[PDB]
Curated annotation (Swiss-Prot):
It comes from the Bacteria. It is found in: Secreted. This is Nuclease A. It comes from Staphylococcus aureus. The chain holds residues 137 to 154 of 231 of the full protein.
Length: 18
């Protein structure tokens, strides 16, 4: 699997600060 673009999204969302 790739799951590359995801990690680059969940991270930003991990502390996006709403």
């Amino acid at each position: 699997g790739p799951e590359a673009s995801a990690f680059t999204k969940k991270m930003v969302e991990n502390a996006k600060k709403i």
